[PDB]
Ligand binder design. Structure first.
Ligand SMILES: *[C@@H]1O[C@H](CO)[C@@H](O)[C@H](O)[C@H]1NC(C)=O
Ligand SMILES: *[C@@H]1O[C@H](CO)[C@@H](O)[C@H](O)[C@H]1NC(C)=O
Ligand SMILES: *[C@@H]1O[C@H](CO)[C@@H](O)[C@H](O)[C@H]1NC(C)=O
Ligand SMILES: [Ca+2]
Lengths: 31, 473
């Protein structure tokens, strides 16, 4: 097979992804 | 002409003030305080010192239920109604609900699966129980969906709870409700899987035509403990009873006409004249004002147009009147209207330039805003740097730094001098006093004075330019 199974079955949040994308965007905004 | 827009703005301000005076009626604060003190401050029984505000366990909840709650709800005068202060009529019957989670919705480590036989997760929609339990006969032991119950989410303190669960509608008499809650307590209703409990009811008070909707919530976190919270909201659903109500309706119509005039005046100008239009800061204030006003008008129209819950309750009065959505939208409307009033009053600065002193001060503020922003960036960076340190170091022991926004609020309260050192000091013998003293010194001795330096420099420069241009030409 199917390969796109529906994500988001819960409400908890992962901070690793948000932090790393925030850093990767701030560095571009300053560069 | 300036005079025309000035006079129309004053008329708009007058009608706004009339609306605010009308909505903020005679002392509803005393209504709310009497209800709050009756249900939140009385001890659960004649021999304990615990009230609803200081619940600490699940047995205290049962003591409160078959106890102070029934004492406050039912007042003695064929199945006669109940007047709470001999004035407030209890509408229909109260309702009690719980939200639960599922056993086995957790992950026990394999090396501990011999002295731990059950783990219940924290509350979440994808983990709530939906199966019958106990003496599965009535509605208190059978799951009911959110659509069959006419519910909605709540946003409590720990999580946001759905509008489903296991519910009971209580009775109109003390004896029957006492029997029902005794039966609920006997066949255990609240167990380790319980996550939240709600109690809901309403009163009328015909003296001043004003309903009151009462909701009491108790949250049971997965880590143990009890967290209580409450909500008393007054409403007006039968508006047109007196002449003052008709006057208020006329004023509301006038407000709608004024908003239409302002938006059409805005669109007549934005069309071709000055396509940029955004380098003024007064146009931004005007557009935000009209956006807030139209949002408030839309909310009011959507909220007062349907009162079908009240009409359905008036058919038979032995049922539960569901007024939660009306209270929610009343709170939303109040917030929107308060912010709109604040901004309308701020907009008055556009017209106070009648002499050479008002213009001087306005020019000073306008020329100072840019570098005030420039330094406020640094000020906020340092503020948040202190806040995150406080959150990480004291956030697990002090209850004043338990959440990040609470850290921000505590740091703002420290500036006013409203600090309690008796708990922060022993949270960390080192790095506790250091944080406090460095924060105080670098906030009052350094960062408060750079604002002064900047403002003082720009004001002096403005005066020097205005006095050198003048008397020399
Ligand atoms: C909960 O589930 C576990 C296994 O998943 C079982 O051993 C235990 O008896 C259950 N407890 C209850 C109260 O259902
Ligand atoms: C459940 O409801 C039925 C309805 O008749 C009643 O007879 C029964 O006693 C109830 N169960 C308990 C434990 O009271
Ligand atoms: C939900 O509203 C409908 C509409 O009248 C009503 O018939 C029904 O009884 C309500 N749900 C409950 C659980 O009372
Ligand atoms: Ca304008």
């Amino acid at each position: 097979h199917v390969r796109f199974v529906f994500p988001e079955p819960t409400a908890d949040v992962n901070y690793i992804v948000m932090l790393t994308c925030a850093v990767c965007l701030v560095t571009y905004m300053v560069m | 002409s300036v005079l025309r827009e000035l006079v129309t703005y004053l008329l708009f301000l007058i009608v706004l003030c009339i609306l605010t005076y009308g909505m903020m009626s005679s002392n509803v604060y005393y209504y709310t305080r009497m209800m709050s003190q009756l249900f939140l401050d009385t001890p659960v029984s004649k021999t304990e010192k615990t009230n609803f505000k200081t619940l600490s366990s699940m047995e205290d909840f049962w003591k409160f239920t078959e106890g102070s709650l029934l004492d406050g709800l039912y007042w003695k005068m064929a199945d006669n109604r109940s007047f709470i202060f001999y004035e407030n009529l209890l509408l229909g019957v109260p309702r009690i609900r719980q939200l639960r989670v599922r056993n086995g919705s957790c992950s026990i480590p394999q090396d501990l699966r011999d002295e731990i036989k059950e783990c219940y997760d924290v509350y979440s929609v994808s983990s709530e129980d939906r199966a019958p339990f106990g003496p599965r006969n009535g509605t208190a032991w059978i799951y009911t969906s959110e659509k069959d119950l006419n519910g909605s989410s709540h946003w409590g303190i720990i999580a946001t709870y759905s509008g489903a669960g296991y519910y009971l509608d209580l009775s109109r008499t003390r004896e029957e409700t006492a029997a029902q809650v005794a039966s609920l307590k006997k066949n255990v209703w609240l167990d380790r899987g319980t996550r939240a409990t709600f109690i809901d009811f309403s009163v009328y008070n015909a003296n001043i035509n004003l309903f009151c909707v009462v909701r009491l919530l108790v949250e049971f976190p997965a880590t143990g403990g009890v967290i209580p919270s409450w909500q008393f909201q007054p409403l007006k659903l039968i508006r047109y009873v007196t002449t003052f109500d008709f006057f208020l309706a006329a004023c509301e119509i006038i407000f709608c006409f004024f908003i239409f005039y302002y938006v059409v005046e805005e669109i007549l100008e934005i069309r071709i004249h000055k396509l940029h239009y955004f380098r003024s800061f007064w146009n931004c204030l005007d557009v935000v004002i009209v956006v807030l006003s139209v949002v408030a008008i839309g909310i009011n129209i959507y909220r007062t147009s349907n009162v079908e819950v009240l009409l359905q309750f008036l058919e038979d009065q032995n049922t539960f009147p569901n007024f939660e959505h009306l209270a929610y939208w009343q709170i939303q409307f109040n917030n929107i209207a308060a912010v709109t009033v604040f901004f309308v009053w701020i907009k008055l600065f556009k017209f106070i330039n009648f002499n050479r002193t008002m213009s001087q001060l306005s020019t000073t503020m306008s020329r100072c805003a840019k570098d005030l922003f420039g330094f406020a960036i640094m000020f906020f960076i340092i503020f948040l740097a202190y806040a995150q340190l406080a959150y990480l170091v004291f956030g697990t022991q002090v209850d004043d730094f338990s959440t990040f926004q609470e850290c921000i609020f505590t740091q703002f309260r420290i500036i006013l001098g409203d600090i309690n050192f008796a708990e922060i000091e022993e949270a960390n013998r080192v790095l506790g006093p250091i944080y406090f003293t460095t924060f105080v010194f670098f906030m009052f001795f350094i960062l408060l004075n750079m604002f002064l330096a900047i403002i003082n420099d720009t004001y002096s420069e403005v005066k020097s330019d205005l006095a050198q241009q003048k008397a020399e030409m």
